[PDB]
Design an enzyme around this catalytic site. Structure first.
Site, PDB file in Angstrom:
ATOM      1  N   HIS A 118      26.559  33.926  58.218  1.00  0.00           N
ATOM      2  CA  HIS A 118      25.147  33.294  58.335  1.00  0.00           C
ATOM      3  C   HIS A 118      24.425  34.375  59.216  1.00  0.00           C
ATOM      4  N   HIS A 124      25.178  28.386  52.226  1.00  0.00           N
ATOM      5  CA  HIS A 124      26.755  27.612  51.877  1.00  0.00           C
ATOM      6  C   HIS A 124      26.914  27.840  50.469  1.00  0.00           C
TER       7      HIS A 124
HETATM    8  C1  LIG Z   1      51.250  27.645  53.657  1.00  0.00           C
HETATM    9  C2  LIG Z   1      49.831  27.534  52.614  1.00  0.00           C
HETATM   10  N1  LIG Z   1      50.502  27.467  51.327  1.00  0.00           N
HETATM   11  C3  LIG Z   1      49.721  28.110  50.029  1.00  0.00           C
HETATM   12  C4  LIG Z   1      48.352  28.796  50.528  1.00  0.00           C
HETATM   13  C5  LIG Z   1      47.656  29.232  49.862  1.00  0.00           C
HETATM   14  C6  LIG Z   1      46.438  29.969  50.498  1.00  0.00           C
HETATM   15  C7  LIG Z   1      45.451  30.633  49.942  1.00  0.00           C
HETATM   16  C8  LIG Z   1      45.040  30.628  48.372  1.00  0.00           C
HETATM   17  C9  LIG Z   1      43.956  31.098  47.844  1.00  0.00           C
HETATM   18  N2  LIG Z   1      42.744  31.657  48.381  1.00  0.00           N
HETATM   19  C10 LIG Z   1      42.377  31.914  49.668  1.00  0.00           C
HETATM   20  C11 LIG Z   1      41.291  31.127  50.267  1.00  0.00           C
HETATM   21  C12 LIG Z   1      41.193  29.865  49.688  1.00  0.00           C
HETATM   22  C13 LIG Z   1      42.720  28.987  49.840  1.00  0.00           C
HETATM   23  C14 LIG Z   1      42.558  27.557  49.273  1.00  0.00           C
HETATM   24  O1  LIG Z   1      41.677  27.072  48.728  1.00  0.00           O
HETATM   25  N3  LIG Z   1      43.017  26.809  50.492  1.00  0.00           N
HETATM   26  C15 LIG Z   1      42.997  25.361  50.276  1.00  0.00           C
HETATM   27  C16 LIG Z   1      43.742  24.569  51.395  1.00  0.00           C
HETATM   28  C17 LIG Z   1      43.468  23.101  51.208  1.00  0.00           C
HETATM   29  O2  LIG Z   1      44.115  22.724  52.481  1.00  0.00           O
HETATM   30  C18 LIG Z   1      44.194  21.357  52.476  1.00  0.00           C
HETATM   31  C19 LIG Z   1      44.092  20.837  53.968  1.00  0.00           C
HETATM   32  O3  LIG Z   1      43.022  20.871  54.591  1.00  0.00           O
HETATM   33  C20 LIG Z   1      42.699  20.870  55.940  1.00  0.00           C
HETATM   34  C21 LIG Z   1      41.353  21.299  56.601  1.00  0.00           C
HETATM   35  O4  LIG Z   1      41.172  20.622  57.813  1.00  0.00           O
HETATM   36  C22 LIG Z   1      40.070  21.219  58.374  1.00  0.00           C
HETATM   37  C23 LIG Z   1      39.105  20.101  59.216  1.00  0.00           C
HETATM   38  C24 LIG Z   1      37.786  20.581  60.013  1.00  0.00           C
HETATM   39  N4  LIG Z   1      36.491  20.347  59.267  1.00  0.00           N
HETATM   40  C25 LIG Z   1      35.640  19.874  59.980  1.00  0.00           C
HETATM   41  O5  LIG Z   1      35.103  18.568  59.351  1.00  0.00           O
HETATM   42  C26 LIG Z   1      35.098  20.278  61.118  1.00  0.00           C
HETATM   43  C27 LIG Z   1      35.421  19.646  62.333  1.00  0.00           C
HETATM   44  C28 LIG Z   1      36.794  19.478  62.539  1.00  0.00           C
HETATM   45  C29 LIG Z   1      37.166  18.565  63.802  1.00  0.00           C
HETATM   46  O6  LIG Z   1      36.997  17.571  63.947  1.00  0.00           O
HETATM   47  O7  LIG Z   1      37.731  19.314  65.089  1.00  0.00           O
HETATM   48  N5  LIG Z   1      33.610  20.336  60.933  1.00  0.00           N
HETATM   49  C30 LIG Z   1      32.991  21.386  60.374  1.00  0.00           C
HETATM   50  O8  LIG Z   1      33.581  22.178  59.697  1.00  0.00           O
HETATM   51  C31 LIG Z   1      31.485  21.125  60.250  1.00  0.00           C
HETATM   52  C32 LIG Z   1      30.961  20.236  59.233  1.00  0.00           C
HETATM   53  C33 LIG Z   1      30.507  19.093  60.023  1.00  0.00           C
HETATM   54  C34 LIG Z   1      29.011  18.418  59.570  1.00  0.00           C
HETATM   55  O9  LIG Z   1      28.800  19.053  58.446  1.00  0.00           O
HETATM   56  O10 LIG Z   1      28.828  17.363  59.826  1.00  0.00           O
HETATM   57  N6  LIG Z   1      30.796  22.485  60.109  1.00  0.00           N
HETATM   58  C35 LIG Z   1      30.732  23.623  61.090  1.00  0.00           C
HETATM   59  O11 LIG Z   1      31.427  23.584  61.958  1.00  0.00           O
HETATM   60  C36 LIG Z   1      30.123  24.900  60.595  1.00  0.00           C
HETATM   61  C37 LIG Z   1      30.576  26.091  61.390  1.00  0.00           C
HETATM   62  C38 LIG Z   1      32.020  26.760  60.620  1.00  0.00           C
HETATM   63  C39 LIG Z   1      32.235  26.645  59.335  1.00  0.00           C
HETATM   64  C40 LIG Z   1      33.682  27.099  59.363  1.00  0.00           C
HETATM   65  C41 LIG Z   1      34.488  27.472  58.104  1.00  0.00           C
HETATM   66  C42 LIG Z   1      33.881  27.092  56.818  1.00  0.00           C
HETATM   67  C43 LIG Z   1      34.934  27.461  55.771  1.00  0.00           C
HETATM   68  C44 LIG Z   1      36.055  28.021  55.930  1.00  0.00           C
HETATM   69  C45 LIG Z   1      36.967  28.314  54.857  1.00  0.00           C
HETATM   70  C46 LIG Z   1      36.993  27.574  53.690  1.00  0.00           C
HETATM   71  C47 LIG Z   1      37.938  27.716  52.687  1.00  0.00           C
HETATM   72  C48 LIG Z   1      38.646  28.925  52.650  1.00  0.00           C
HETATM   73  C49 LIG Z   1      38.560  29.868  53.861  1.00  0.00           C
HETATM   74 CL1  LIG Z   1      39.470  31.544  53.641  1.00  0.00          CL
HETATM   75  C50 LIG Z   1      37.864  29.384  54.812  1.00  0.00           C
HETATM   76  C51 LIG Z   1      36.515  28.392  57.219  1.00  0.00           C
HETATM   77  C52 LIG Z   1      35.741  28.081  58.314  1.00  0.00           C
HETATM   78  N7  LIG Z   1      33.936  27.415  60.596  1.00  0.00           N
HETATM   79  O12 LIG Z   1      32.825  27.187  61.212  1.00  0.00           O
HETATM   80  C53 LIG Z   1      28.578  24.488  60.937  1.00  0.00           C
HETATM   81  P1  LIG Z   1      27.439  25.760  60.311  1.00  0.00           P
HETATM   82  O13 LIG Z   1      27.528  25.683  58.870  1.00  0.00           O
HETATM   83  O14 LIG Z   1      27.516  27.183  61.022  1.00  0.00           O
HETATM   84  C54 LIG Z   1      25.899  24.971  60.692  1.00  0.00           C
HETATM   85  C55 LIG Z   1      25.623  24.619  61.821  1.00  0.00           C
HETATM   86  C56 LIG Z   1      24.419  24.021  62.281  1.00  0.00           C
HETATM   87  C57 LIG Z   1      23.468  23.869  61.163  1.00  0.00           C
HETATM   88 BR1  LIG Z   1      21.685  23.106  61.576  1.00  0.00          BR
HETATM   89  C58 LIG Z   1      23.865  24.058  59.988  1.00  0.00           C
HETATM   90  C59 LIG Z   1      24.925  24.793  59.640  1.00  0.00           C
HETATM   91  C60 LIG Z   1      41.924  32.060  47.438  1.00  0.00           C
HETATM   92  C61 LIG Z   1      40.599  32.576  47.430  1.00  0.00           C
HETATM   93  C62 LIG Z   1      40.000  32.989  46.307  1.00  0.00           C
HETATM   94  C63 LIG Z   1      40.360  32.620  45.004  1.00  0.00           C
HETATM   95  C64 LIG Z   1      39.875  33.016  43.586  1.00  0.00           C
HETATM   96  S1  LIG Z   1      38.350  33.625  43.940  1.00  0.00           S
HETATM   97  O15 LIG Z   1      37.999  34.086  42.432  1.00  0.00           O
HETATM   98  O16 LIG Z   1      37.336  32.540  44.469  1.00  0.00           O
HETATM   99  O17 LIG Z   1      38.483  35.050  44.845  1.00  0.00           O
HETATM  100  C65 LIG Z   1      40.401  32.560  42.672  1.00  0.00           C
HETATM  101  C66 LIG Z   1      41.543  32.102  42.529  1.00  0.00           C
HETATM  102  S2  LIG Z   1      42.302  31.683  41.246  1.00  0.00           S
HETATM  103  O18 LIG Z   1      43.754  31.161  41.282  1.00  0.00           O
HETATM  104  O19 LIG Z   1      41.297  30.695  40.320  1.00  0.00           O
HETATM  105  O20 LIG Z   1      42.156  33.246  40.260  1.00  0.00           O
HETATM  106  C67 LIG Z   1      42.229  31.700  43.692  1.00  0.00           C
HETATM  107  C68 LIG Z   1      41.844  32.083  44.982  1.00  0.00           C
HETATM  108  C69 LIG Z   1      42.358  31.694  45.967  1.00  0.00           C
HETATM  109  C70 LIG Z   1      43.836  31.133  46.376  1.00  0.00           C
HETATM  110  C71 LIG Z   1      43.784  29.745  45.782  1.00  0.00           C
HETATM  111  C72 LIG Z   1      44.935  31.910  45.495  1.00  0.00           C
HETATM  112  C73 LIG Z   1      50.291  27.983  49.042  1.00  0.00           C
HETATM  113  C74 LIG Z   1      50.891  29.307  48.466  1.00  0.00           C
HETATM  114  C75 LIG Z   1      49.689  27.063  48.123  1.00  0.00           C
HETATM  115  C76 LIG Z   1      51.699  27.307  49.381  1.00  0.00           C
HETATM  116  C77 LIG Z   1      51.600  27.015  50.820  1.00  0.00           C
HETATM  117  C78 LIG Z   1      52.452  26.432  51.505  1.00  0.00           C
HETATM  118  C79 LIG Z   1      53.766  25.854  50.786  1.00  0.00           C
HETATM  119  C80 LIG Z   1      53.938  26.086  49.499  1.00  0.00           C
HETATM  120  C81 LIG Z   1      54.870  25.614  48.521  1.00  0.00           C
HETATM  121  S3  LIG Z   1      56.175  24.877  49.389  1.00  0.00           S
HETATM  122  O21 LIG Z   1      56.891  24.381  48.282  1.00  0.00           O
HETATM  123  O22 LIG Z   1      56.848  25.610  50.190  1.00  0.00           O
HETATM  124  O23 LIG Z   1      55.576  23.869  50.291  1.00  0.00           O
HETATM  125  C82 LIG Z   1      55.070  25.832  47.345  1.00  0.00           C
HETATM  126  C83 LIG Z   1      53.968  26.560  46.601  1.00  0.00           C
HETATM  127  S4  LIG Z   1      54.310  26.836  45.043  1.00  0.00           S
HETATM  128  O24 LIG Z   1      52.927  26.818  44.593  1.00  0.00           O
HETATM  129  O25 LIG Z   1      54.707  27.965  44.781  1.00  0.00           O
HETATM  130  O26 LIG Z   1      55.032  25.899  44.435  1.00  0.00           O
HETATM  131  C84 LIG Z   1      52.928  27.039  47.325  1.00  0.00           C
HETATM  132  C85 LIG Z   1      52.776  26.793  48.734  1.00  0.00           C
HETATM  133 ZN   LIG Z   2      27.631  27.267  57.601  1.00  0.00          ZN
END
Ligand SMILES: CCN1/C(=C/C/C=C\C=C2/N(CCCCC(=O)NCCCOCCOCCOCCCNC(=O)[C@H](CCC(=O)O)NC(=O)[C@H](CCC(=O)O)NC(=O)[C@H](Cc3cc(-c4ccc(-c5cccc(Cl)c5)cc4)no3)CP(=O)(O)c3ccc(Br)cc3)c3ccc4c(S(=O)(=O)O)cc(S(=O)(=O)O)cc4c3C2(C)C)C(C)(C)c2c1ccc1c(S(=O)(=O)O)cc(S(=O)(=O)O)cc21
Ligand SMILES: [Zn+2]
Ligand SMILES: [Ca+2]
Ligand SMILES: [Ca+2]
Ligand SMILES: [Ca+2]
Ligand SMILES: [Zn+2]
Length: 159
Positions: A118, A124
């Site tokens: 960020h 996102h």
């Molecule tokens: C042991 C284990 N194991 C395993 C493993 C494997 C691993 C890996 C693999 C891979 N890769 C790596 C990475 C991925 C992975 C995955 O996918 N994983 C999945 C897991 C699932 O798990 C399930 C459970 O879950 C639980 C969770 O819980 C947590 C809760 C919490 N949350 C909440 O809600 C809070 C609160 C809490 C409390 O209450 O305390 N809150 C929150 O968050 C807020 C919201 C509220 C509202 O909205 O209302 N928010 C906040 O705070 C913000 C701040 C922040 C954020 C943060 C973060 C975010 C994100 C993250 C992440 C995610 C994902 C991933 C990562 Cl590294 C990281 C972190 C952190 N922090 O803080 C607020 P803001 O935004 O700043 C704001 C403020 C104010 C305003 Br106005 C606006 C805004 C991988 C990678 C890649 C790949 C590819 S590419 O092309 O894409 O490169 C491709 C591929 S392919 O295949 O197609 O070629 C692949 C890939 C990959 C993979 C898949 C390879 C295994 C191995 C599976 C295993 C294990 C164990 C065991 C086992 C077994 S046994 O039998 O032993 O058991 C077995 C097996 S087998 O298969 O061999 O059979 C296996 C295994």
């Molecule tokens: Zn965020």
């Protein structure tokens, strides 16, 4: 096109840290998030500890200075503003969520990738495989790949 950054050198700064995670985990999750978009664009992201940065990362709850208040635990996890000066590009994360480095709670890395999208000007997708899909989804950080739609979207803005 909507708003896009008119530079390929983009800085970011983490304004404050969530008590849910230890500090280095937050640093690592955010750094990897930017790198996800850096992997498919001519964009380079550099971290700033003190001073002005394009993208400010903030952890806050409820109403927090902009016209878009958070809603407590659940619902809206975060929001980001499109490219531009001031609050533009900034990404805010709801502190009422429990941020983690894993499947439990809300994964910061995945949310950050979505929000930075960020921040870069993406909308996102209706593809459940796309990271710019409207609703959160967890996936192991290394079974994770950018969907073709994410890549097509971001490359149409930069490069
Ligand atoms: C042991 C284990 N194991 C395993 C493993 C494997 C691993 C890996 C693999 C891979 N890769 C790596 C990475 C991925 C992975 C995955 O996918 N994983 C999945 C897991 C699932 O798990 C399930 C459970 O879950 C639980 C969770 O819980 C947590 C809760 C919490 N949350 C909440 O809600 C809070 C609160 C809490 C409390 O209450 O305390 N809150 C929150 O968050 C807020 C919201 C509220 C509202 O909205 O209302 N928010 C906040 O705070 C913000 C701040 C922040 C954020 C943060 C973060 C975010 C994100 C993250 C992440 C995610 C994902 C991933 C990562 Cl590294 C990281 C972190 C952190 N922090 O803080 C607020 P803001 O935004 O700043 C704001 C403020 C104010 C305003 Br106005 C606006 C805004 C991988 C990678 C890649 C790949 C590819 S590419 O092309 O894409 O490169 C491709 C591929 S392919 O295949 O197609 O070629 C692949 C890939 C990959 C993979 C898949 C390879 C295994 C191995 C599976 C295993 C294990 C164990 C065991 C086992 C077994 S046994 O039998 O032993 O058991 C077995 C097996 S087998 O298969 O061999 O059979 C296996 C295994
Ligand atoms: Zn965020
Ligand atoms: Ca919320
Ligand atoms: Ca900004
Ligand atoms: Ca929290
Ligand atoms: Zn906000």
């Amino acid at each position: 096109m909507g708003p896009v950054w008119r530079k390929h050198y983009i800085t970011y700064r983490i304004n404050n840290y969530t008590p849910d995670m230890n500090r280095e985990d937050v640093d690592y999750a955010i750094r990897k998030a930017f790198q996800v978009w850096s992997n498919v664009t001519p964009l380079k992201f550099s971290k700033i500890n003190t001073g002005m940065a394009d993208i400010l990362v903030v952890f806050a709850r409820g109403a927090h200075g902009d016209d878009h208040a958070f809603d407590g635990k659940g619902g809206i996890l975060a929001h980001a503003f499109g490219p531009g000066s001031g609050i533009g590009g900034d990404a805010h994360f709801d502190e009422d969520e429990f941020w983690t480095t894993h499947s439990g709670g809300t994964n910061l890395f995945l949310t950050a990738v979505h929000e930075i999208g960020h921040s870069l000007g993406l909308g996102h997708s209706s593809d459940p495989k796309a990271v710019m899909f409207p609703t959160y989804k967890y996936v192991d950080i290394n079974t994770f790949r950018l969907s073709a739609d994410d890549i097509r979207g971001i490359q149409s803005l930069y490069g």
